[PDB]
Design an enzyme around this catalytic site. Structure first.
Site, PDB file in Angstrom:
ATOM      1  N   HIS B  41       0.807  -1.212   0.000  1.00  0.00           N
ATOM      2  CA  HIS B  41       0.000   0.000   0.000  1.00  0.00           C
ATOM      3  C   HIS B  41       0.844   1.268   0.000  1.00  0.00           C
ATOM      4  O   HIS B  41       0.320   2.337  -0.327  1.00  0.00           O
ATOM      5  CB  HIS B  41      -0.934  -0.009   1.215  1.00  0.00           C
ATOM      6  CG  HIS B  41      -2.150   0.843   1.045  1.00  0.00           C
ATOM      7  ND1 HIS B  41      -3.226   0.458   0.273  1.00  0.00           N
ATOM      8  CD2 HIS B  41      -2.459   2.066   1.539  1.00  0.00           C
ATOM      9  CE1 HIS B  41      -4.145   1.407   0.298  1.00  0.00           C
ATOM     10  NE2 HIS B  41      -3.705   2.394   1.059  1.00  0.00           N
ATOM     11  N   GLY B 136      -0.524   5.544  11.172  1.00  0.00           N
ATOM     12  CA  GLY B 136       0.905   5.434  10.977  1.00  0.00           C
ATOM     13  C   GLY B 136       1.536   4.157  11.489  1.00  0.00           C
ATOM     14  O   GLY B 136       2.767   4.056  11.495  1.00  0.00           O
ATOM     15  N   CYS B 138       0.978   1.092  10.148  1.00  0.00           N
ATOM     16  CA  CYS B 138       1.078   0.068   9.116  1.00  0.00           C
ATOM     17  C   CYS B 138       2.517  -0.420   8.997  1.00  0.00           C
ATOM     18  O   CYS B 138       3.465   0.367   9.067  1.00  0.00           O
ATOM     19  CB  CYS B 138       0.597   0.610   7.765  1.00  0.00           C
ATOM     20  SG  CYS B 138      -0.976   1.518   7.815  1.00  0.00           S
TER      21      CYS B 138
HETATM   22  O1  LIG Z   1      -2.477  -1.492   3.914  1.00  0.00           O
HETATM   23  C1  LIG Z   1      -2.888  -0.324   4.134  1.00  0.00           C
HETATM   24  C2  LIG Z   1      -2.004   0.671   4.676  1.00  0.00           C
HETATM   25  O2  LIG Z   1      -0.728   0.291   4.930  1.00  0.00           O
HETATM   26  C3  LIG Z   1      -2.432   1.943   4.934  1.00  0.00           C
HETATM   27  C4  LIG Z   1      -1.596   3.023   5.477  1.00  0.00           C
HETATM   28  C5  LIG Z   1      -1.562   4.269   4.839  1.00  0.00           C
HETATM   29  C6  LIG Z   1      -0.775   5.289   5.336  1.00  0.00           C
HETATM   30  O3  LIG Z   1      -0.721   6.518   4.737  1.00  0.00           O
HETATM   31  C7  LIG Z   1      -0.004   5.080   6.477  1.00  0.00           C
HETATM   32  O4  LIG Z   1       0.773   6.090   6.966  1.00  0.00           O
HETATM   33  C8  LIG Z   1      -0.032   3.842   7.118  1.00  0.00           C
HETATM   34  O5  LIG Z   1       0.740   3.687   8.236  1.00  0.00           O
HETATM   35  C9  LIG Z   1      -0.815   2.816   6.623  1.00  0.00           C
HETATM   36  O6  LIG Z   1      -3.723   2.310   4.649  1.00  0.00           O
HETATM   37  C10 LIG Z   1      -4.625   1.421   4.140  1.00  0.00           C
HETATM   38  C11 LIG Z   1      -5.896   1.916   3.918  1.00  0.00           C
HETATM   39  C12 LIG Z   1      -6.840   1.043   3.395  1.00  0.00           C
HETATM   40  O7  LIG Z   1      -8.097   1.485   3.158  1.00  0.00           O
HETATM   41  C13 LIG Z   1      -6.522  -0.291   3.101  1.00  0.00           C
HETATM   42  C14 LIG Z   1      -5.249  -0.754   3.336  1.00  0.00           C
HETATM   43  O8  LIG Z   1      -4.943  -2.039   3.054  1.00  0.00           O
HETATM   44  C15 LIG Z   1      -4.256   0.104   3.866  1.00  0.00           C
END
Ligand SMILES: O=c1c(O)c(-c2cc(O)c(O)c(O)c2)oc2cc(O)cc(O)c12
Ligand SMILES: O=c1c(O)c(-c2cc(O)c(O)c(O)c2)oc2cc(O)cc(O)c12
Lengths: 294, 294
Positions: B41, B136, B138
Site C-alpha cells: 500500500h 501510521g 502500518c
Molecule cells: O495497507 C494499508 C495501509 O498500509 C495503509 C496506510 C496508509 C498510510 O498513509 C499510512 O501512513 C499507514 O501507516 C498505513 O492504509 C490502508 C488503507 C486502506 O483502506 C486499506 C489498506 O490495506 C491500507
C-alpha cells in the site's frame, strides 16, 4: 483504535541484563557503564558482616557468553554494586527514578540473566506489585522509557504470601514496609486507584464505549463519600487537573465522569463490558491513556 | 506466582524496524538481511500497474539516522520487497511462519520506523486481531520467539469498521477474507477459543483460584452441546491431548475442567473473579500457560 496493556519496547533493557553468581546463588543483574546492580541477597543476617567476608573473585558475572571481571564491590541499601573492568557498550541513556503508588512501569522478567517476557505493572497503593515471577527472577528490573532515556524504577526481590511481589528502587530502598529477609511480613490492605479508573473510562469513550455515561454530575466531596465506601482512593482537586486534557478531548467534565463511576460502583455493569473488561481497571494512568488514545 | 499477558522481549525485532517513504506515504518496514519488507500500500488499484511505474530511487528507506539505498524492488502478494545494498547487521535468526486462529503472538507497535510499545495478541477465529494501532502503524509486525529464533507471523495493514485489525503473514497473504483496498469488507462473526479458556482455568488452579471447580465430569459431546449455545468453538479430542500436560500438573482431568466451564457459562461468576478477571479469558494458549506457570 483499540486499547491494550502496552509495555515499552524492552531492547534497551535487554542489553543490560547479566547473570550474577556468588556461592550457590544465581540471580539477575543490571549492567550499566562499569557497574553491575543486583539484590544483595545474592551473598546469603547482617549483610555488612556477610559482605566484609567476600572478595571480588567470589562474584561470577556473565554477560551472555563473556565473563566480566569484578574489580570492586560495595553495598547501597538492599542493592549490591559490583564494579567491573568493562563498561557496557550497550548502556543506554538512563536515570534512577523512584515512582509513586498509582504509576505504571514495564517489567522485563529475566531468568539466569536471560530475558523471557515483558509486561506492564502498576505500583499498588500498598507498595506491592501484581507481577508474574517464577523462581530465579530476582534482579529483574522495572522501567519507563522517555524518548531515548530509560528510567529504571524497580528491582524485584521477593514474593509475599498473598502472591504479590515486593522490591526496591535502584538505590536499594524498598517500596513499602518490607525487608529482604524471611519474616512474618505481609502486604497491607490495598485500595483502588481512583484517578486511573477515571482515565480508563475516558479511554473507553475515546474508543466508542459510552453506555455507562449519564447526564448527572457530582461534587468532588460527594464522590469521595461514595468512593470511601467501595475502598477507592479519595479523588483530589489535583487529580482533576491531570484528567483535564482527557476531559477536553472527549468534552466530558471530570465530575461528569465521576457520576458515571459512582453509578457503576452502586449498580455494577449488568452483564456489559468496558474495553473488553467486566470490572473497573485501575492500572492505566492518565499519561498511559493519552499515549495510546492520542 | 502471578499471571499476566506477557509479550516476548522485543529487542531482536526493534533492531529490524525501518521507515519506508514513497511519494507522500510513510509507513514501517522490516529489514532482514538485505531486504526491507513493508505493505505494498505504500506505493498508492492494480498494484502490478503501480509498481511497474516505480523506480528504485522512488523509495526512501531510513534505518534510524542512516538512509538505505534501494537497489531492487519486487512484490510478493500484498507485501513489497525492497532490496538494499546493506545487510542488516542486527538480523536475528528468523523464520516466516503463518499462525492458526487461537494462537498468540507479540506485536511491536511502531510509528515512523520507531517502536513505541509491545503487547500480546491472539489471532481470533474470524482472522482479525484486537490490537492497539493508531494512524501510521502500518507495517508493524507480530512475532514469537523460540530460544533465539524470531518467527515473524503478522504484518499490520488496516483497521476494520468494528475497530479490529487485519493484516498478512510475511509472505503477503492476508489472514482472512480481507483485501488491501477500500471496500465494504467487515469482520465476520467471532467465536470464543474454548481450548484457551480451559488452559486459562488451569493457570488459575496453578495460581490458587479453585472456587469454580466442582466434583462433576462431562462427556466431550455433552460439553460441545453447551459450548455451541454460548458461541464457543467445539472442543476436539486433539484439544484434550494438548491440555494433557496441564491436567497432570494439577491432577484435574480435562473433562473435569470442562464441567466447571459449563457451570461458569450457565451461572456466571456471581461477583467473583478468576486471575483478576471478571470474564472468561480466551487469549492464553496451553503453551502460554506452561511457559508462565511452570
Ligand atoms: O495497507 C494499508 C495501509 O498500509 C495503509 C496506510 C496508509 C498510510 O498513509 C499510512 O501512513 C499507514 O501507516 C498505513 O492504509 C490502508 C488503507 C486502506 O483502506 C486499506 C489498506 O490495506 C491500507
Ligand atoms: O531478595 C531476595 C532474593 O533475591 C531471593 C532469591 C534467591 C535465589 O536463590 C534466587 O535464585 C533468586 O532469583 C532470588 O530470595 C529471597 C528470599 C527471601 O526470603 C527474601 C528476599 O529478600 C529474597
Amino acid at each position: 483504535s483499540g486499547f491494550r496493556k502496552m509495555a515499552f519496547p524492552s531492547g534497551k533493557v535487554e542489553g543490560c541484563m547479566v547473570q550474577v553468581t556468588c556461592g550457590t546463588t544465581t540471580l539477575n543483574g543490571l549492567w550499566l557503564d562499569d557497574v553491575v546492580y543486583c539484590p544483595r541477597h545474592v551473598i546469603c543476617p547482617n549483610y555488612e558482616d556477610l559482605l566484609i567476608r567476600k572478595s571480588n573473585h567470589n562474584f561470577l558475572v556473565q554477560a551472555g557468553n563473556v565473563q566480566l571481571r569484578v574489580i570492586g564491590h560495595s553495598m547501597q541499601n538492599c542493592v549490591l554494586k559490583l564494579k567491573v573492568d568493562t563498561a557496557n557498550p550497550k548502556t543506554p541513556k538512563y536515570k534512577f527514578v523512584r515512582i509513586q503508588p498509582g504509576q505504571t512501569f514495564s517489567v522485563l522478567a529475566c531468568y539466569n540473566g536471560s530475558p523471557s517476557g515483558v509486561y506492564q505493572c502498576a505500583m499498588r497503593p500498598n507498595f506491592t506489585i501484581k507481577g508474574s515471577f517464577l523462581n530465579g527472577s530476582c534482579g529483574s528490573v522495572g522501567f519507563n522509557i522517555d524518548y531515548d532515556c530509560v528510567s529504571f524504577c524497580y528491582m524485584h526481590h521477593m514474593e509475599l504470601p498473598t502472591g504479590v511481589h515486593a522490591g526496591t528502587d535502584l538505590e536499594g530502598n524498598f517500596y513499602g514496609p518490607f525487608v529482604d529477609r524471611q519474616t512474618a511480613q505481609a502486604a497491607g490492605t490495598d485500595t483502588t486507584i481512583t484517578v486511573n479508573v477515571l482515565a480508563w473510562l475516558y479511554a473507553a469513550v475515546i474508543n466508542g464505549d459510552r453506555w455507562f455515561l449519564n447526564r448527572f454530575t457530582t461534587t468532588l466531596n460527594d464522590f469521595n463519600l461514595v468512593a470511601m465506601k467501595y475502598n477507592y482512593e479519595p479523588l483530589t482537586q489535583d487529580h482533576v487537573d491531570i484528567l483535564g486534557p482527557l476531559s477536553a478531548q472527549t468534552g466530558i467534565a471530570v465530575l461528569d465522569m465521576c457520576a458515571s463511576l459512582k453509578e457503576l460502583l452502586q449498580n455494577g455493569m449488568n452483564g456489559r463490558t468496558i474495553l473488553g473488561s467486566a470490572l473497573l481497571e485501575d492500572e492505566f494512568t492518565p499519561f498511559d491513556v493519552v499515549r495510546q488514545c492520542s
